[PDB]
Amino acid sequence: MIRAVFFDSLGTLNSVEGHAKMHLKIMEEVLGDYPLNPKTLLDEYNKLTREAFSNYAGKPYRGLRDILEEVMRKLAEKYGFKYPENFWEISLRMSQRYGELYPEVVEVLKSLKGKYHVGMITDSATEQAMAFLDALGIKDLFDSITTSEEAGFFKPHPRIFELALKKAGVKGEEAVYVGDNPVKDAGGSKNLGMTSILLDRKGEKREFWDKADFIVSDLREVIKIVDELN
Ligand SMILES: *CC(=O)c1ccccc1
Numbered sequence: 001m002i003r004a005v006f007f008d009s010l011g012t013l014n015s016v017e018g019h020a021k022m023h024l025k026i027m028e029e030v031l032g033d034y035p036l037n038p039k040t041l042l043d044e045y046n047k048l049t050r051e052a053f054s055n056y057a058g059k060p061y062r063g064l065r066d067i068l069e070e071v072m073r074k075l076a077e078k079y080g081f082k083y084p085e086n087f088w089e090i091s092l093r094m095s096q097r098y099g100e101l102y103p104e105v106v107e108v109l110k111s112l113k114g115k116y117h118v119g120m121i122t123d124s125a126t127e128q129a130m131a132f133l134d135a136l137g138i139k140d141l142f143d144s145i146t147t148s149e150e151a152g153f154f155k156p157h158p159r160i161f162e163l164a165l166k167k168a169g170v171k172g173e174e175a176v177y178v179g180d181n182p183v184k185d186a187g188g189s190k191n192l193g194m195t196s197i198l199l200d201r202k203g204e205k206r207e208f209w210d211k212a213d214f215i216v217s218d219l220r221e222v223i224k225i226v227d228e229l230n
């Protein structure tokens with residue numbers, strides 16, 4: 001019986017659109033009137049960071065701040081603008097203002113909280129995850145928050161899911177994982193026996209739907225699935 005529902009972060013609870021808007025504002029503040037299109041800087045930053053994150057999926061945890069700051073160091077040297085020593089602090093300030101939840105998130109978390117264990121499982125440093133949940137106003141809505149930093153490994157490594165399950169006191173088969181990445185979220189959680197729900201908000205991933213037990217475009221569908229399973 002489903003006793004716990006676990007959620008991914010980016011693309012699942014906080015929007016990619018807010019992420020992109022937030023990060024453009026970060027680059028605009030980095031650059032000022034430097035003669036570089038902030039959108040061009042952002043696209044190159046995203047290209048490099050995506051490659052780095054891909055390299056480390058499933059692998060031992062390493063600090064994301066060191067990776068992002070090195071990428072920025074490279075980009076500052078490539079393009080000739082002054083490296084921002086306060087890059088991280090700029091980023092935090094912009095997260096607090098421009099971080100954005102999908103419209104149904106609070107409704108969904110509220111409807112589940114109390115009746116099931118409500119958890120988050122995220123690739124993130126712990127302090128950074130807790131700060132952003134606070135900034136979005138949803139920290140209190142979780143019974144557990146489990147991170148790659150705690151487990152020692154990035155998704156889809158089994159230990160990050162194992163830890164979340166152990167925090168909640170449930171078996172994998174008594175738990176659901178909702179996330180937007182078919183490999184890291186659906187495939188990763190399945191290795192622990194969890195029921196996997198792929199969130200495909202824009203229907204962009206039908207190539208990979210077979211990788212999940214269920215497909216949804218809106219998190220309000222989750223509660224119906226759990227009830228139906230129970
Ligand atoms: C994208 C970014 O700068 C960010 C995101 C979440 C929390 C803090 C910073």
Ligand SMILES: [Mg+2]
Pocket residue numbers: 008009010011012179180181
């Ligand atoms: Mg995600």
